[PDB]
Write a protein that binds this ligand. Structure first.
Ligand code: SF4
Ligand SMILES: [Mg+2]
Ligand SMILES: [Mg+2]
Ligand SMILES: [Mg+2]
Ligand SMILES: [Mg+2]
Ligand SMILES: [Mg+2]
Ligand SMILES: [Mg+2]
Ligand SMILES: [Mg+2]
Ligand SMILES: [Mg+2]
Ligand SMILES: [Mg+2]
Ligand SMILES: [Mg+2]
Ligand SMILES: [Mg+2]
Ligand SMILES: [Mg+2]
Ligand SMILES: [Mg+2]
Ligand SMILES: [Mg+2]
Ligand SMILES: [Mg+2]
Ligand SMILES: [Mg+2]
Lengths: 99, 99, 83, 208
RNA sequence: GUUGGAGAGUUUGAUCCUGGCUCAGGGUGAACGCUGGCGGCGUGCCUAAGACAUGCAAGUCGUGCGGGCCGCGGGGUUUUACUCCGUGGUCAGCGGCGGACGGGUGAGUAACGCGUGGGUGACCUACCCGGAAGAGGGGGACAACCCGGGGAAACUCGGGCUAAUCCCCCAUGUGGACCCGCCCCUUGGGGUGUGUCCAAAGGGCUUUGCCCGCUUCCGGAUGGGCCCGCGUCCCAUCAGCUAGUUGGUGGGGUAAUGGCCCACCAAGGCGACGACGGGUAGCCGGUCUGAGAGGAUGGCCGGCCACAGGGGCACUGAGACACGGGCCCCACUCCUACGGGAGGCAGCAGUUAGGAAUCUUCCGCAAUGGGCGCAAGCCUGACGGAGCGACGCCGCUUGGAGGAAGAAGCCCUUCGGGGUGUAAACUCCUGAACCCGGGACGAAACCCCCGAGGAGGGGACUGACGGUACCGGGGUAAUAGCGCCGGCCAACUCCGUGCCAGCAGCCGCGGUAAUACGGAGGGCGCGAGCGUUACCCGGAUUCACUGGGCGUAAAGGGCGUGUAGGCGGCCUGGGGCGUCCCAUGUGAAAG
């Protein structure tokens, strides 16, 4: 009586739930480095982008955070840590920051 | 063709923004007379040196605000306040239709 | 993709197709890009099949794969002859 | 489809000998050469002034009845003449004689267009070797009008084919008796076919 | 071989003028009245975006993966049972691609919605094509299935396994992305340096090869998002509207600019060139009229928009805020075993209600087209076809010739005759319908062979329309109706009627001897149609741009002053805004 191709909903929901995960994982994660970059440290902070960045890209392998939307976060996030760090610190350990 | 337009200002009263008033002159599609039609544009003056009386040029530019999609281009002449009157007086003729 | 399909016209009981290119998701008789020849299967004329064999190789190069009743026509006109 | 009614009334009503019957037409028993006045009771009674709209209707009816045709085709095959370049009044007289049911009459295969149309419609006349059973066939130049060989032996055609033998065919046709084929040469002018029609009136009619 | 313009009746004793009303014309997605034959092509719910029974319209892939199930061949512990290998088909499931195209509607929208021209240094595009470089290892998940439990179905829960083009990590890095500087145009474009980050799938066959896939990157084509100048209905009896409003700083957000969202600042924004509000309405190419200018219309063909009972909502994907996907509130409806469930024809038919009115619950993928697997092939109410309806256009038939100084009946009269009238009957001539025999075009490719899965060539299966069209032969004269007859307006007499019955679009006619009413005879116009009504344009130079007026006909403000606006004497020079000329692009197709 109905379209057996309603299966796409199943595929949709597990895709959705398998999207909210990693996308939100970028959030709280990159919400951790900023405070750390604000509250001072860099070793245990510039180490975080290192993985944060790696995840954004990994989201871009699939249909989650796709496109150059990473290049919206991967650009505006490592845009602040710099300015964050000269506020007591100066760009410290050899992480993702060029010079 | 990014539509260059030339027109007299009307205000210098907002930050980085002015009010170019340009004039269009054309016939009447029904009557052979050649009539005037005018329109007000809002422009982008980041130097804040385009001021009142300045007869300037504007261009179809990238969106800057809601009603601000044109940039200022260059200057033609500054000593033109007698036209601003014709705006200052018209809108003050608008005064006398009330209670 | 983009197709080299046909567009049927003419009176009923007189199919007159236009060897044409639309986008794939387009109606049979819509805003095509390029007509490249007429086609009648009922054989009313001696010149009953024109084909831009040079302009075809445009869209054939830029990526336009056609249908059975479209590939054979380019052969009947000789687009694949080049040797 | 056609008139199918009383014919001699037409000829009396328009005060002109409409040659529609056939052999009786030129005979001394042509109703006009018997009763030359409009029919129906008030014939001999004094006919008052023709209203300025009248005389332009009647000539229009003359031609209409001369060729045996309705008034949609008459109009539609008149619209074309008005649009088609040239003098409006005689292009119209061109696309008329081009009609198949006329030509056969002009070819003397029949003495009457009304007679001719039947022969056309019945599968007897042939154009370029094809069984054309259409009266309203715009005969184009260089066409082969002939009696179908499958029916070129009836007891009607020969009598009326013989009846022509050496008749002065229209100065625009080519008749071959026994060969039974008649080729459409050029195309007519009013000066080539003189009729009692001020065709300009039909214009002035169809402009009111 | 395209070209364009007609007026008339009506006020008065009578005339001229202004002036209005009415008519003849063309068109219809029309209906209705009376008739009614055939075929070709089209077209067919404007009304209630109201409610829908039922059937059908969105699937495809074993050359991706695992499994239940049925046939066929092989089997195993020597063994029942059973279990297994291979091949075909079917059921479903994980997975990939398609359900964002197709098809319907016109509620909404007075808006960058549409049309036109541009911009994008502000972006997107899977399947297509072209070029460069690659696929080395390891881990795992959830359904299908098994067990159990519940419900009438809907369905759902709890436990336990597992494969893969599924998930995840590491390895390399053609190359892409990012922060910070540097080389050139300039809005985020183009390189480069150091640092950081990012890849991968297998399946098959004729395996030392080929087809189909995968991953990163650049480019083309197509298809989109957005911004802008310009034109787009009425009401001035709507004269003020504005607190995200208007600009900015900064952050967010998306593929991208944005006052799209939020925080702080300064008061700014719009309007008589008509802001705000009200009413109507989808827009265009086109269509109808008009000589033109103009006026009205956008059904069906095609382009764009918006909607899928009303409304909001986000997910999935490259793409929707998605008609036949999901969620939630409202209203409606349907189902039952009463605990509870479900549904959305403005998709093809078809029903109901509303109406003056609107199609068969048909056939087939043969064709074109679309989606899937390479491929055979599946699906395709898109479509191609037929079915209904004189709704429109066109074509065609109800016979042709001969035939009476003129049968019959009917009509008129002055009784002598005159009309229907070649009209009828009659002779001949062909033969719509009918009958038989043949029988299509639309249909040559996907497939197979040779050939390299190339080029090229050879071979073969396939039709709903339809035994239709058509063709060959035979063979009967065989439906005609409607309006009008006072002027406009073509077409006349008799009878009855006697301000009654009635006709009538304007004038008007009928008040006894009617060419207007009712009937006949006859005549005029059309003809398988004819008339009525409604609407659009015209006629209406009667909103006057072409193309009008204001002494007495409707019309000069009661006068003055004056802002905005409109308009402006003579001469010279400049810029060339309007203006004019040439080229080029666009102006899609259909019209
Ligand atoms: S010419 Fe013929 S049609 Fe004319 S009236 Fe005489 S017979 Fe009758
Ligand atoms: Mg304006
Ligand atoms: Mg001229
Ligand atoms: Mg831009
Ligand atoms: Mg592009
Ligand atoms: Mg401002
Ligand atoms: Mg509306
Ligand atoms: Mg539906
Ligand atoms: Mg939820
Ligand atoms: Mg098919
Ligand atoms: Mg018909
Ligand atoms: Mg008339
Ligand atoms: Mg009386
Ligand atoms: Mg004027
Ligand atoms: Mg007076
Ligand atoms: Mg006044
Ligand atoms: Mg052009």
């Amino acid at each position: 009586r109905n379209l057996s191709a309603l299966k796409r909903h199943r595929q949709s929901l597990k895709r959705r739930l398998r999207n909210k995960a990693k996308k939100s994982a970028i959030k709280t994660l990159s919400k951790k480095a900023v405070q750390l970059a604000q509250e001072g440290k860099a070793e245990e902070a510039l180490k975080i982008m290192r993985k944060a960045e790696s995840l954004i890209d990994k989201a871009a392998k699939g249909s989650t955070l796709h496109k150059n939307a990473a290049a919206r976060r991967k650009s505006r996030l490592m845009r602040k840590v710099r300015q964050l760090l000269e506020a007591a610190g100066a760009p410290l350990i050899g992480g993702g920051l060029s010079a | 063709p990014k539509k260059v337009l030339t027109g007299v200002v009307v205000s210098d009263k907002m930050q980085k923004t002015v009010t170019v008033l340009v004039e269009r002159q054309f016939p009447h599609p029904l009557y052979g007379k050649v009539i005037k039609r005018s329109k007000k544009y809002l422009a982008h003056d980041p130097e804040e040196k385009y001021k009142l009386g300045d007869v300037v040029e504007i261009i179809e530019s990238r969106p800057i605000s809601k009603r601000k999609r044109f940039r200022v281009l260059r200057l033609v002449e500054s000593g033109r306040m007698d036209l601003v009157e014709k705006y200052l007086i018209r809108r003050q003729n608008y005064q006398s239709l009330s209670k | 993709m983009v197709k080299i399909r046909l567009a049927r016209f003419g009176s009923k009981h007189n199919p007159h197709y236009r060897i044409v290119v639309t986008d794939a998701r387009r109606k049979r008789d819509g805003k095509y890009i390029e007509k490249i020849g007429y086609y009648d299967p009922r054989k009313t004329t001696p010149d009953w099949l024109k084909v831009d064999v040079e302009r075809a190789r445009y869209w054939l190069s830029v990526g336009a794969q056609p249908t059975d009743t479209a590939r054979r026509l380019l052969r009947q006109a000789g687009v694949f002859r080049q040797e | 489809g056609r008139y199918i009614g009383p014919v001699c009334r037409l000829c009396r009503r328009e005060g002109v000998k409409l040659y529609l019957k056939g052999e009786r037409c030129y005979s001394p028993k042509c109703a006009m050469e018997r009763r030359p006045y409009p029919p129906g009771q008030h014939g001999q009674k004094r006919a008052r002034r023709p209203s300025d709209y009248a005389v332009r209707l009647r000539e229009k009816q003359k031609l209409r009845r001369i060729y045996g045709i309705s008034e949609r085709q008459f109009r539609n095959l008149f619209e074309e003449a008005s649009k088609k370049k040239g003098v409006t009044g005689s292009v119209f007289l061109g696309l008329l004689e081009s009609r198949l049911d006329n030509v056969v009459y002009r070819l003397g295969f029949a003495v009457s267009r009304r007679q001719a149309r039947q022969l056309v419609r019945h599968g007897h006349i042939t154009v370029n070797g094809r069984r054309v059973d259409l009266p309203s066939y715009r005969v184009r130049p260089g066409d082969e009008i002939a009696v179908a060989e499958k029916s070129r032996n009836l007891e009607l055609i020969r009598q009326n084919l013989e009846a022509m033998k050496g008749r002065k065919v229209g100065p625009w046709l080519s008749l071959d008796v026994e060969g039974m084929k008649g080729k459409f040469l050029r195309l007519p002018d009013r000066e080539d076919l003189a009729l009692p029609v001020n065709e300009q009136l039909v214009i002035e009619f169809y402009s009111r």
